[PDB]
Ligand binder design. Structure first.
Ligand code: PT5
Ligand code: 3PE
Ligand code: 3PE
Ligand code: PS1
Ligand code: Y01
Ligand code: Y01
Ligand code: Y01
Ligand code: CLR
Ligand code: CLR
Ligand code: CLR
Ligand code: CLR
Ligand code: CLR
Ligand code: NAG
Ligand code: CA
Length: 1377
């Protein structure tokens, strides 16, 4: 209440500081609360609960004083609204215990957010995040539509199929404790002999995952979209109904909804960041940074000058001057090259010494490393002392690197002292000295870019801390919410899961794990199970859905913005410094040449990012031996090259048909002769190429180009393999096996032979070359982390089969395994964990597995349970080790991966596009004038002959009621498809069938009506309309098949035609349709980039088939050890399609490390292999899987960046500046004015033409007439003898006027700029007919009556009329006196 203006006093700033302190204290109090099951309470919680009155009183006082002093504008600000609603909720919850409302205790989680309300900088940072996040809403709409379509399809196909397991024969009891879907026929999974398939098993994941309602379907589809547990669903559906067709539903689901959506998100975010960079404030900040850097460079030069000049000022301790002379000498010695190189050598030696440490290093090695660490510490301390005494204490402290070395020395001393005081743990702090190896980049040319990146990072260091703090605040808020909702309710009968919400650290860990997206579905299952189950706890899935959906995209936005901004700033600084040093060199040389006058290349092609950024900057600033020749002839012969390509393709296809399981299969025997023929052909090709190229240092010979060496390796391996089996094959079979494996290089023999495929491979190679230095930095940081992890967790990853025994000596004999309803005797084994930290290599592998995201929660549990060396784990021993894995996730996967993505996006090179030096104005005019060339008016039927009946019904068809009725029926049919649910009555199903019949009859009637209105040819000349006709036919066919009965079921793919009506709704989402069409066109434009990935998958599938193809799958252990036995009947290598499925599953990143472990050596072989010993599987699996993951990720990233950069014009468009996107509205309206659409429209209506559409192309309905006529003058559009203007001629004038293409201000200059434009268009479009050129750029005759002349005359007449009218008024007002 305002209360007028009586004695109201402002508040002093430490009042606000006290409010912040109160908020922090309340956050601490909320974080110090523990939740216990049922009604138990800790004593500390009871004390903590009584502090709420004080906090609510302070908040009430703040709200009251602010509202009384401000005289509510309190509710105008959103932050004040949040504070006010928090205050009211708290005071209502506290006062009045009616109904025991705890839902109003959940509002307290939002109190941490009041810190942002207090601090305006956090408000600014949230504004920055949210503004960039707004464009993603259109992507979310696409995601929702795709999820809805796939949920409808799954509900239609997978309805209630997962409620049938292998029940016991005699009784209705589950056969085992791991139920799986079953069927009652061969295609499905048949139950064992003593079991039967009986209905209503609960279902996978306790029934949470299923397709029963439209809600379960949507949740299931979303979970599959997050790439979590989708292979489990694929395997369950394969068990339930066979594996023939389920892949067509699951793999395209992943491809469309997880990779395509990610590509769209990356493109939109990149466009938003590019548009944000060129804003005025960011430009001013960058200019300030660049000027400061120039100042620092000049200062450094002058400081070197003064240092050298002052050093030459020279010309016991007090008596002798040696105390200063020797300091001068050592200061001179410091800057010598040797004093730097030897220090780097010692740093490298220390790095090697700390890397050597492993689990069972010999005792002499331990002593040597102890003494070596002491000696290295002493030597580095001596280097510190010499540096400080030579250069001076203050100059030493001023340098940042000297401070870093001081920190490392102090850390080493602290580690030594702590190890002496408290033996048991070591942090290996000395390994951080390896960061000094980054100084080696100074001798290379890569130092400038890295230094600029570091400078840009250090400049915007507050804006990074603020972003991290806001991320932490959101994590804290969600952790508090999870504690309020679930809390102590996770005490299941089988034990509390490690990912619980009981305590605050556990809540933070769980929320972080959900944000990273790893095993979030299991936590969701536990959360749903806590409040009942599938019956009455399914509403709590919203928490996890919101958490993961927001976390993925917020992490992506927050880190990609940082990476892109800093890398772009670094690139621009580097380019500017290079150009300014070049300019200074030429200017200095020119000025110096005046004194000696008496005696007397190409810049690198700019990236698409840089070109578009420069264009946007300019646009914004505008606002203000006979056989040797015979063989040479043969290799140039067309039939030969086509035959070689055909033979290579046949070889690749043949490699995919072999049988890994059975060497003596009838198909392998046949394929052997194909191998003979292919080897002979390749021998002939190689020998003829040898004849032409030669061998004796011709410098253009065979062995100079790598592809020739590859071909030689392939053919020589084939011949050697044929040679060894020459006699006695049983001597060595691995030898012939490896040489057979060498055949997989045949697919690669097309990269050189297909010019475009080589043009894609070279682009991939350039992408590798651009990111090499960041890769080196990434490897160095990962090496440091691996060494630290080795120090922390060396030998601590030993466990026992019996958990009660801690040491090795106790883990011998037999122990009782108390399982549900059965007690089993097992053996005690002192096993090591699957992924440990024993040496640097194992640590690197484990950290790579963690970075890929798979199985890192298990590694975290093992790390926090590690007690001591050679000792069993104890749960919750050292919970502080979670900081290691938090920092690792913050550094590598969140920051370095996004740096890689940003660098590849920024430094992308446009494919082809010739050299474009001759062309001048094509930055944005290309597509505009090209669309002007290829512009076609929209055509309606318009016969005009049959006005009596045909015209009326044509009007009826294309009319707002018709379109709205179609949309309404589409929406209702969508709802009808959604209302299917499991367990409905027969009447419900019959009603749904009748509704479907009615809707399809309505659609058929509209098809008939449009056919009548337009004519069959015009009906069938519009792709959407053929789609409608096909869908109608499919629905009719489905209905006829249903009503027929019996016969063949004709599957259910006809019902996909029923469900495909949703695509018709895309005709209203203009922005969405344009986005989808642009990205699909870009994907179609690049066919070989999508072929390189296919080739990679092919090669790796063949390698897997030939290496791991014979691993046995029949064996199932007593416990089955699901973790390690991941090679089953669903995830095997036995055939090409199964190998491809396994490769795709690994590419999606789902327990690939377990597959890698399962493919190692020592595994049992298959019965039909022919090997009777456990000698199947190789240690090659490590390299196989790691290289596959890296290469697949790189190739998908390259494809995504290629598509984004191809669409980068649309992604960075601006509404104010004309683009080809707005041109279609013009086209539509122009076609509309003329029903015939002959291409000529009267010049009078052209004024109404411009006013209806919005600027920049149009003028707007509010445009003044004088402003309207002024633009018309610049168009100079000629008028035809029939007083009409041509469609194409108007468009070119419209485009030209808005973009100022060559636009001269008048005079003879106009003819020259028309002449130059004509030559450029002919140079770009040689096939453009002269008639079209004269139509687009009209030859200017003086006699021609243009539109500008017509409008100029009326203004002159109007000005003359107005001037005359004023003159009569003037001659009258002056006469009345
Ligand atoms: C956001 C998620 C978490 C982000 C961080 C996660 C993970 C960290 C990620 C970091 C990304 C870094 C990527 C690039 C990294 C290295 C590129 C090459 C290194 C590099 O550029 O060299 C150094 C750092 O060297 C170190 O000792 C090693 C010091 C390493 C410092 C690392 C942190 C720096 C960034 C902090 C970011 C803010 C936090 C940076 O160069 P500089 O900026 O120090 O350059 C100075 C400066 O030019 C001075 O005039 C001169 O000497 P002083 O007067 O003694 O300072 C020297 O001139 P030169 O540059 O000609 O020698 C340098 O000392
Ligand atoms: C934003 C853009 C959105 C775009 C959305 C695009 C969505 C496309 C998604 C793919 C659609 C097809 C999904 C197929 C799922 C099949 C599920 C299934 O269970 O099929 C097997 C089943 C036979 O099993 P049975 O138990 O006898 O009958 C079950 C009926 N309740 O039923 C059958 O007998 C099979 C039924 C036919 C299934 C496939 C029909 C072909 C569809 C695509 C053809 C492509 C060309 C052919 C390629 C493969 C050749 C083998
Ligand atoms: C093509 C070169 C590389 C392409 C990769 C490019 C993008 C990567 C995308 C990954 C590709 C995934 C394709 C998956 C293929 C089939 C997956 C699957 O589960 O197939 C199962 C099913 C039966 O497999 P199979 O064991 O061969 O049949 C029994 C024979 N005794 O198999 C079938 O019966 C399916 C029959 C046709 C398979 C579809 C083609
Ligand atoms: C050397 C440079 C490597 C760069 C790699 C791409 C980096 C940019 C991609 C990106 O950041 O998007 C992250 C997004 C999050 O999905 P996610 O968090 O749901 O991943 C789930 C997890 N993998 C699991 O199944 O356990 O989705 C992803 O996880 C990315 C999907 C895998 C990588 C791209 C496809 C490659 C396989 C076909
Ligand atoms: C900057 C880079 C180039 C430095 C060189 C690489 C090192 C970090 C790696 C390369 C190979 C590694 C070695 C590979 C295998 C072993 C054997 C390992 O010994 C045992 O397994 C048992 C020893 C015993 O019982 O006597 C001790 C560590 C060591 C030397 C590793 C120490 C770390 C090494 C030297
Ligand atoms: C995607 C491009 C690279 C072409 C696709 C290549 C493979 C996916 C295709 C091509 C020929 C196909 C083969 C052609 C014939 C057969 C025989 C067919 O008969 C059998 O069951 C084995 C024969 C027997 O039982 O004696 C089994 C599938 C198989 C191996 C096919 C498996 C899939 C192959 C290798
Ligand atoms: C985006 C980034 C900046 C946010 C990451 C959040 C971190 C600040 C959180 C997440 C996990 C937290 C850790 C989880 C577990 C612990 C152990 C715990 O310390 C104990 O000794 C508690 C004993 C026990 O819980 O049994 C509390 C501190 C610590 C290191 C926590 C400190 C704060 C951490 C690192
Ligand atoms: C050399 C390394 C990078 C190989 C590439 C491995 C790929 C498969 C890994 C490494 C980087 C990873 C992603 C980087 C970014 C994100 C987004 C964040 O919301 C969760 C972590 C997550 C999901 C990571 C999971 C999968 C991922 C793409
Ligand atoms: C090598 C070229 C032709 C590529 C095409 C390979 C495919 C289409 C051909 C080549 C050799 C063929 C095999 C030759 C012999 C047999 C043994 C017979 O009992 C079953 C079919 C089977 C297993 C054939 C299946 C189809 C097959 C694998
Ligand atoms: C950015 C570069 C320099 C990486 C170096 C920083 C890494 C290696 C440091 C930063 C913070 C560190 C952690 C801080 C605190 C603890 C608790 C202690 O009881 C065990 C080690 C542990 C868990 C440290 C492990 C190493 C660690 C993660
Ligand atoms: C566009 C909007 C208004 C319509 C979408 C909502 C419809 C399609 C959804 C939302 C709520 C859903 C219902 C929710 C609960 C049940 C009870 C269950 O035993 C059978 C399915 C049934 C009956 C669902 C059928 C589909 C349903 C009616
Ligand atoms: C490009 C690739 C081939 C180069 C990398 C080579 C290294 C990482 C890999 C590739 C081939 C691998 C070998 C292939 C086969 C075997 C037989 C197995 O019973 C023991 C390990 C051993 C001896 C592997 C050791 C690791 C290995 C040497
Ligand atoms: C399993 O099926 C085979 C079919 O011949 C039969 O020999 C065997 O006895 C069956 N086992 C049981 C439990 O009947
Ligand atoms: Ca996963």
């Amino acid at each position: 209440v305002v209360r007028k203006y009586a004695k109201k006093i402002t508040e002093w700033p430490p009042f606000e500081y006290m409010i912040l302190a109160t908020i922090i204290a309340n956050c601490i109090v909320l974080a110090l609360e523990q939740h216990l099951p049922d009604d138990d309470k800790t004593p500390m919680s009871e004390r903590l609960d009584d502090t709420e009155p004080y906090f609510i009183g302070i908040f009430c006082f703040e709200a009251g004083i602010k509202i009384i002093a401000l005289g509510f504008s309190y509710l105008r600000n959103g932050w004040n609204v949040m504070d006010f609603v928090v205050v009211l909720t708290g005071i209502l919850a506290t006062v009045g215990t009616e109904f025991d409302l705890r839902t109003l205790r959940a509002v307290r989680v939002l109190r941490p957010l009041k810190l942002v309300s207090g601090i305006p900088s956090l408000q600014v940072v949230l504004k920055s995040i949210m503004k960039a996040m707004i464009p993603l809403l259109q992507i979310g709409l696409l995601l929702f539509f795709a999820i809805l379509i796939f949920a409808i399809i799954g509900l239609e196909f997978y309805m209630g199929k997962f409620h049938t397991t292998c029940f016991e024969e005699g009784t209705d009891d589950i056969q085992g404790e791991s139920p799986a879907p079953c069927g009652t026929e061969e295609p499905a999974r048949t139950c064992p002999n003593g079991t039967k398939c009986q209905p209503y098993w609960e279902g996978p994941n306790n029934g949470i995952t299923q397709f029963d309602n439209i809600l379960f379907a949507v949740l299931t589809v979303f979970q599959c979209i997050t790439m979590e547990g989708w292979t489990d669903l694929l395997y369950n559906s394969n068990d339930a109904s066979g594996n023939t067709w389920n892949w067509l539903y699951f793999i395209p689901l992943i491809i469309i909804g997880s990779f395509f959506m990610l590509n769209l998100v990356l493109g939109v975010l990149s466009g938003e960041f590019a548009k944000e960079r060129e804003r005025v404030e960011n430009r001013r900040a960058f200019l300030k940074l660049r000027r400061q850097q120039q100042i620092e460079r000049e200062l450094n030069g002058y400081m070197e000058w003064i240092s050298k000049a002052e050093e030459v000022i020279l010309a016991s301790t007090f008596f002798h001057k040696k105390e200063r002379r020797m300091r001068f000498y050592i200061r001179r010695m410091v800057k010598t090259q040797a004093f730097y190189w030897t220090v780097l050598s010692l740093v490298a030696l220390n790095t090697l010494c700390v890397a050597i440490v492993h689990y069972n290093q010999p005792e002499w090695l331990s002593d040597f490393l102890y003494y070596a660490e002491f000696i290295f510490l002493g030597l580095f301390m001596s280097e510190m002392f010499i540096k400080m005494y030579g250069l001076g204490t203050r100059p030493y402290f001023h340098s940042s690197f000297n401070c870093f070395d001081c920190g490392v020395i102090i850390g080493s001393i602290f580690e030594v002292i702590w190890a002496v005081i408290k033996p048991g743990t070591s942090f290996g702090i000395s390994v951080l000295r390896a960061l000094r190896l980054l100084r080696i980049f100074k001798v290379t040319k890569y130092w400038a870019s890295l230094r600029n990146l570091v400078v840009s990072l250090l400049n915007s260091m507050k804006s990074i801390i603020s972003l991290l703090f806001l991320l932490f605040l959101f994590i804290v808020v969600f952790a508090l919410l999870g504690m309020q909702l679930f809390g102590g309710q996770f005490n299941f009968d089988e034990g509390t899961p490690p990912t619980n919400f009981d305590t605050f650290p556990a809540a933070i860990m769980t929320v972080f794990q959900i944000l990273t997206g790893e095993d979030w579905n299991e936590v969701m299952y536990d959360g749903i199970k806590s409040q009942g189950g599938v019956q009455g706890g399914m509403v709590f899935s919203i928490y996890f859905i919101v958490l993961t959906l927001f976390g993925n995209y917020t992490l992506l936005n927050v880190f990609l913005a940082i990476a892109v901004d800093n890398l772009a700033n670094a690139q621009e600084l580097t380019k500017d410094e290079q150009e300014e040093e070049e300019a200074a060199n030429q200017k200095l040389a020119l000025q110096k040449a005046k004194e000696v006058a008496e005696v007397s290349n190409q810049k690198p092609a700019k990236s698409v990012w840089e070109q578009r950024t420069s264009e946007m900057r300019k646009q914004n600033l505008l606002a203000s031996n006979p056989l040797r020749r015979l063989c040479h002839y043969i290799l140039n012969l067309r039939y030969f090259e086509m035959c070689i390509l055909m033979v290579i393709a046949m070889s690749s296809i043949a490699l995919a048909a072999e049988d890994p399981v059975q060497p003596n299969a009838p198909r392998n025997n046949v394929l052997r002769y194909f191998d003979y023929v292919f080897t002979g052909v390749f021998t002939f090709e190689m020998v003829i190429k040898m004849i032409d190229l030669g061998l004796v240092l011709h410098q253009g010979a065979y062995f100079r180009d790598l592809w020739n060496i590859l071909d030689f390796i392939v053919v020589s391996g084939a011949l050697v393999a044929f040679a060894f089996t020459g006699n006695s094959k049983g001597k060595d079979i691995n030898t012939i096996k490896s040489l057979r494996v060498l055949r997989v290089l045949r697919p690669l023999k097309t990269i050189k032979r297909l010019p475009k495929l080589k043009a894609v491979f070279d682009c991939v190679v350039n992408s590798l070359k651009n990111v090499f230095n960041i890769l080196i930095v990434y490897m160095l940081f990962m090496f440091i982390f691996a060494v630290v992890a080795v120090q922390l967790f060396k030998g601590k990853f030993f466990h026992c089969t019996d958990e009660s025994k801690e040491f090795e000596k106790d883990c011998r004999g037999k122990y009782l395994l108390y399982e549900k309803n059965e007690v089993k005797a097992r053996d005690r084994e002192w096993k090591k964990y699957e992924f440990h930290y024993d040496n640097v290599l194992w640590a690197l592998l484990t950290l790579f597995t963690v970075s890929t995201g798979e199985g890192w929660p298990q590694v975290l549990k093992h790390s926090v349970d590690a007690t001591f060396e050679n000792q069993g784990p104890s749960p919750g021993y050292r919970m502080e080790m979670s900081i290691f894995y938090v920092v690792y996730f913050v550094v590598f996967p969140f920051f370095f991966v996004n740096i890689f993505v940003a660098l590849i996006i920024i430094t992308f090179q446009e494919q082809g596009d010739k050299m474009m030096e001759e062309y001048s104005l094509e930055k944005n005019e290309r597509a505009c004038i090209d669309f002007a060339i290829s512009a076609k008016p929209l055509t309606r039927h318009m016969p005009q002959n049959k006005q009596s009946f045909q015209y009326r019904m044509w009007q009826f068809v294309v009319s707002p009621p018709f379109e709205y009725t179609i949309m309404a029926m589409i929406a209702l049919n969508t709802i009808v498809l959604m209302m299917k649910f499991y367990g409905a009555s027969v009447a419900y199903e019959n009603a749904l069938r009748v509704f479907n019949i009615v809707f399809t009859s309505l659609f058929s009637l509209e098809c008939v009506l449009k056919v009548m209105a337009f004519g069959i040819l015009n009906y069938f000349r519009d792709a959407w309309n053929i789609f409608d006709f096909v869908t109608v036919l499919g629905s009719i066919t489905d209905i006829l098949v249903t009503e027929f009965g019996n016969n063949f079921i004709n599957l259910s793919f006809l019902r996909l035609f029923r469900a495909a009506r949703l695509i018709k709704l895309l005709r209203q989402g203009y922005t969405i349709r344009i986005l989808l069409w642009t990205f699909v066109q870009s994907f179609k434009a690049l066919p070989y980039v999508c072929l390189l990935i296919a080739m990679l998958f092919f090669i790796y599938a063949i390698i897997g088939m030939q290496v791991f193809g014979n691993i046995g799958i029949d064996v199932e252990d007593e416990d089955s050890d699901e973790d390690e036995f991941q090679i089953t009947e669903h995830n095997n290598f036995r055939t090409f399609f199964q190998a491809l499925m396994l490769l795709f599953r690994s590419a999606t990143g789902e327990a690939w490390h377990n597959i890698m472990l399962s493919c190692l050596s020592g595994k049992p072989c298959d019965k039909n292999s022919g090997i009777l010993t456990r000698e199947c599987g190789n240690e090659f699996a490590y390299f196989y899987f790691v290289s596959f993951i890296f290469l697949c990720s790189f190739l998908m990233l390259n494809l995504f960046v290629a598509v984004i950069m191809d669409n980068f014009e649309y992604l960075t468009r601006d509404s104010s500046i004309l683009g080809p996107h707005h041109l279609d509205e013009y086209v539509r309206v122009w076609a509309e004015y003329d029903p015939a659409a002959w291409g000529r429209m009267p010049y009078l209506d052209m004024y109404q033409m411009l006013r209806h559409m919005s600027p920049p192309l149009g003028l707007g309905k509010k445009c003044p007439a004088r402003v309207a006529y002024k633009r018309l003058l610049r168009m100079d559009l000629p008028v035809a003898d029939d007083n009409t203007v041509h469609f194409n001629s108007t468009l070119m004038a419209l485009i030209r006027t808005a973009l100022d293409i060559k636009i001269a201000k008048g005079g003879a200059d106009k003819q020259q700029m028309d002449a130059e434009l004509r030559k450029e268009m002919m140079a770009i479009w040689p096939n453009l007919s002269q008639k079209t050129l004269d139509l687009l750029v009209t030859p200017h005759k003086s006699t021609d009556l243009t539109v500008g002349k017509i409008y100029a005359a009326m203004m002159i007449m109007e000005y003359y009329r107005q001037s005359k009218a004023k003159k009569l008024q003037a001659m009258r007002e002056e006469q009345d006196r």
